[PDB]
Amino acid sequence: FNKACELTDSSWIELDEIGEDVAPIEHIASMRRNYFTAEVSHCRATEYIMK
Amino acid sequence: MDVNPTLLFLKVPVQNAISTTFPYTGDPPYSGTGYTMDTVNRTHQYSEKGKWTKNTETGAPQLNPIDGPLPEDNEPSGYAQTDCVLEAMAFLEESHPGIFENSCLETMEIVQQTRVDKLTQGRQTYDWTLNRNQPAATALANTIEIFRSNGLTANESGRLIDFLKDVMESMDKEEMEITTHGKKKQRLNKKSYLIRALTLNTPGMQIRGFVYFVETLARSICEKLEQSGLPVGGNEKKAKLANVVRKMMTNSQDTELSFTITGDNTKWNENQNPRMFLAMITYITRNQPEWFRNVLSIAPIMFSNKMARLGRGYMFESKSMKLRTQIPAEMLANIDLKYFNELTKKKIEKIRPLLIDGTASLSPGMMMGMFNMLSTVLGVSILNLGQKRYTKTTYWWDGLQSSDDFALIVNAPNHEGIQAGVDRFYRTCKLVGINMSKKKSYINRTGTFEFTSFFYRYGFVPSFGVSGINESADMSIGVTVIKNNMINNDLGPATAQMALQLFIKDYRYTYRCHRGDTQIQTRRSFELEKLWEQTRSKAGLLVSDGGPNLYNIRNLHIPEVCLKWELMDEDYQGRLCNPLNPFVSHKEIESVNNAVVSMEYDAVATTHSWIPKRILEDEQMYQKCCNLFEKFFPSSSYRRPVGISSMVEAMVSRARIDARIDFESGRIKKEEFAEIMKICSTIEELRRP
Amino acid sequence: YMFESKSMKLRTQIPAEMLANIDLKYFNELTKKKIEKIRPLLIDGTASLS
Numbered sequence: 001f002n003k004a005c006e007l008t009d010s011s012w013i014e015l016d017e018i019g020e021d022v023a024p025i026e027h028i029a030s031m032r033r034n035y036f037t038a039e040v041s042h043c044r045a046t047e048y049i050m051k
Numbered sequence: 052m053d054v055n056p057t058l059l060f061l062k063v064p065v066q067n068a069i070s071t072t073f074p075y076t077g078d079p080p081y082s083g084t085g086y087t088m089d090t091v092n093r094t095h096q097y098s099e100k101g102k103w104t105k106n107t108e109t110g111a112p113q114l115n116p117i118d119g120p121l122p123e124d125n126e127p128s129g130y131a132q133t134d135c136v137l138e139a140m141a142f143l144e145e146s147h148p149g150i151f152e153n154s155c156l157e158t159m160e161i162v163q164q165t166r167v168d169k170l171t172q173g174r175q176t177y178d179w180t181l182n183r184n185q186p187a188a189t190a191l192a193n194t195i196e197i198f199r200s201n202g203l204t205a206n207e208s209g210r211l212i213d214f215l216k217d218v219m220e221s222m223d224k225e226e227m228e229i230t231t232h233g234k235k236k237q238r239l240n241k242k243s244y245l246i247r248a249l250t251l252n253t254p255g256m257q258i259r260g261f262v263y264f265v266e267t268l269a270r271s272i273c274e275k276l277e278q279s280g281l282p283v284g285g286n287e288k289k290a291k292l293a294n295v296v297r298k299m300m301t302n303s304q305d306t307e308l309s310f311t312i313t314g315d316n317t318k319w320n321e322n323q324n325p326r327m328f329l330a331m332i333t334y335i336t337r338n339q340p341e342w343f344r345n346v347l348s349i350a351p352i353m354f355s356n357k358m359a360r361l362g363r364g365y366m367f368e369s370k371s372m373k374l375r376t377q378i379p380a381e382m383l384a385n386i387d388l389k390y391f392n393e394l395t396k397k398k399i400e401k402i403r404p405l406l407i408d409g410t411a412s413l414s415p416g417m418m419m420g421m422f423n424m425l426s427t428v429l430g431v432s433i434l435n436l437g438q439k440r441y442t443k444t445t446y447w448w449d450g451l452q453s454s455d456d457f458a459l460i461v462n463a464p465n466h467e468g469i470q471a472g473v474d475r476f477y478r479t480c481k482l483v484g485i486n487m488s489k490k491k492s493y494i495n496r497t498g499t500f501e502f503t504s505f506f507y508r509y510g511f512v513p514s515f516g517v518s519g520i521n522e523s524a525d526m527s528i529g530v531t532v533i534k535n536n537m538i539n540n541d542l543g544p545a546t547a548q549m550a551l552q553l554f555i556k557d558y559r560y561t562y563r564c565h566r567g568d569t570q571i572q573t574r575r576s577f578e579l580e581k582l583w584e585q586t587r588s589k590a591g592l593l594v595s596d597g598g599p600n601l602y603n604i605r606n607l608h609i610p611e612v613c614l615k616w617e618l619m620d621e622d623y624q625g626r627l628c629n630p631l632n633p634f635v636s637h638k639e640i641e642s643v644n645n646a647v648v649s650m651e652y653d654a655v656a657t658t659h660s661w662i663p664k665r666i667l668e669d670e671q672m673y674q675k676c677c678n679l680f681e682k683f684f685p686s687s688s689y690r691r692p693v694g695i696s697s698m699v700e701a702m703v704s705r706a707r708i709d710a711r712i713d714f715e716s717g718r719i720k721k722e723e724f725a726e727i728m729k730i731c732s733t734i735e736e737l738r739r740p
Numbered sequence: 741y742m743f744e745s746k747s748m749k750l751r752t753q754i755p756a757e758m759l760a761n762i763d764l765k766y767f768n769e770l771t772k773k774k775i776e777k778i779r780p781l782l783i784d785g786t787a788s789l790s
Contacts, residue, residue, distance in 0.1 A: 001054060002052075002053060002054055005054045015549075015552040015553070015556065016552045016553075016555045016556050016559070016600065017552075017555075017599065017600045018548055018551060018552060018600060018602070018603050019600055019601035019602055019603040019606070020601075020603065021603055021747075022603075022605060022747075023603070023604060023605045024747070024748050024749050025544055025604070026544070026548075026603050026604050026605060027747060027748055028544065028545075029543075029544030029545045029547065029548050029604065030545075030548065032544070032545035033545040033548050033549055036545065036549075
């Protein structure tokens with residue numbers, strides 16, 4: 001678990017596309033989602049997800 | 052740093068991070084006759100001090116604990132009292148004036164207008180014709196066929212109650228001859244037929260009717276009560292909790308000490324004696340037509356004589372020859388026990404007397420379901436014996452019940468008062484028949500509690516992917532779910548967008564719909580590649596085809612085809628929305644946008660609306676006739692036809708009429724017309740006998 | 741200055757005293773040139789005008 005909660009040198013998850021953002025709430029949602037994906041796209045748990 | 056995620060609760064309240072306490076986001080991959088024997092034995096151990104009678108009809112030993120000795124310990128017990136249940140129901144009626152009388156009439160309209168097809172809507176049911184599980188519709192068909200062969204055809208009226216008259220008439224027949232298609236006919240003795248009729252499974256088609264009327268009466272009652280949240284879902288149960296809590300914790304004075312008793316009832320389906328349900332339906336249906344008391348009081352009568360079937364059996368294996376048999380449950384009664392282990396030895400020895408031709412005699416209990424809603428009424432009866440009028444003292448209680456889920460509040464003036472109130476509620480429940488679970492219930496001052504996975508703390512706090520029906524019926528179901536959860540279950544914006552992204556990834560990986568520009572190689576790749584070159588505007592392409600996405604949050608409700616309409620090519624519109632497709636298929640208004648998942652989704656019936664691949668003598672006889680009639684009368688698939696002629700007469704009349712208007716229009720080449728008319732004459736002749 | 745985000749519906753204001761450090765991306769080209777040319781003369785929020 002300790003290792004699975006660690007970052008790595010990669011971007012393991014490549015998610016699909018989403019339509020353009022027009023709703024002032026859609027922009028906030030995109031900002032939050034981008035922050036999360038950036039903070040989590042490297043975790044070895046994501047590597048296990050993919051594998 | 053040894054990471055310990057649970058320590059996160061040291062800063063965030065548990066209710067505000069309870070998500071992390073639910074491990075599985077879907078259905079776990081993991082999952083016998085031993086369990087059935089255990090459930091049969093434990094029920095009889097909870098009623099040891101009960102009368103041991105011998106049903107003279109089914110020939111089974113039955114156990115009657117009602118009006119038995121009062122419990123002498125906290126252990127679970129089912130020695131419920133008729134006086135107490137009747138008094139509880141009477142006090143319930145007084146609090147809610149004219150509830151039973153008003154609800155019986157709303158059930159009168161349903162016990163008469165209901166057809167015999169309501170016994171098909173459901174799940175797998177035991178089939179007394181073959182002693183084998185088998186779908187609901189086919190089980191009903193088999194039962195009807197056997198009844199017709201035996202001469203019980205009053206079910207031809209199309210009324211459910213007439214079918215019930217037929218099953219009760221059968222219950223008196225001396226022999227029921229079953230014809231199986233080799234063509235072997237077997238005759239059942241009256242006794243042999245009875246046990247096969249009063250049999251649960253690990254419940255027959257002869258009990259779906261009465262238990263439907265009892266359940267609808269219970270639902271009608273529960274809708275009126277505001278202390279019952281069973282005949283509701285989601286937003287409804289999220290309002291009753293708030294109302295009750297805000298009612299009780301707004302004490303007019305600081306004297307009142309509120310306390311909530313979040314908890315459950317143990318063995319809730321092994322102590323609810325059917326005889327007790329008969330003794331509260333004979334009260335609910337008071338001063339009602341005597342034919343309305345003999346139809347709602349049959350299932351309780353039948354459930355108290357039920358002969359549960361053990362199941363498959365145990366397998367015997369030798370470590371030398373590595374053999375494996377099954378030991379069918381029938382022979383367990385007459386067998387040498389040296390083979391079995393110790394625990395199985397004790398279980399089979401205990402249950403041996405109760406066996407009758409391989410069938411249990413679980414009289415003193417009620418299996419899961421089967422008045423899941425009447426038991427809710429019983430439970431709310433005792434949540435009503437706390438209204439400060441039937442207590443006569445300072446402490447009073449309220450709450451909700453959802454069939455073994457209650458959130459009882461015990462307002463009182465001091466801690467001793469709260470303890471006395473909890474004790475009295477527990478004792479009353481034990482008298483009525485409800486055994487509270489002391490290993491899962493915790494009492495804490497009001498403000499935070501839990502009710503069937505609804506975690507209330509000063510405020511409230513598996514359906515993502517391809518459903519797998521069509522290609523356009525999934526890009527609608529998934530997007531509809533992503534907004535249903537975003538409106539109801541508080542799913543937020545960013546989570547919604549993430550779910551949409553992952554849903555589209557699953558969509559494109561399951562239907563091989565990856566965009567044309569990307570270079571993932573699959574069977575459908577080449578075709579999509581070509582389709583990605585012809586088109587001038589590529590935004591219009593459906594995600595099902597090689598095409599982009601446009602669903603963010605502001606159009607999660609718009610169906611896809613109407614979303615990409617201005618962006619679509621005319622040469623593409625023509626092919627996509629071509630009513631002469633060989634793929635589009637829908638033969639009923641039922642499934643013209645309705646997936647079992649039953650969900651109401653939006654679709655535009657494009658070429659992506661295709662359908663995936665997959666006792667009577669001819670199981671399709673009814674299907675053949677109905678398909679032919681639909682052919683003759685196209686509106687047979689939309690509106691239930693109404694008429695007085697027989698099917699053959701109507702079909703031949705329309706066949707004659709259509710031909711005449713056709714030959715008069717020159718589209719039938721007279722020689723064909725004469726042949727059609729002579730064929731109609733032949734069919735009409737065949738109808739004379 | 742007054743900055744308006746028309747995709748978020750936001751209307752914020754930048755006081756003149758912050759013109760000495762604010763990143764020169766929000767403004768248009770002409771205002772960017774003006775700010776760049778005047779920055780060397782900014783002392784204590786004012787601008788020498790000898």
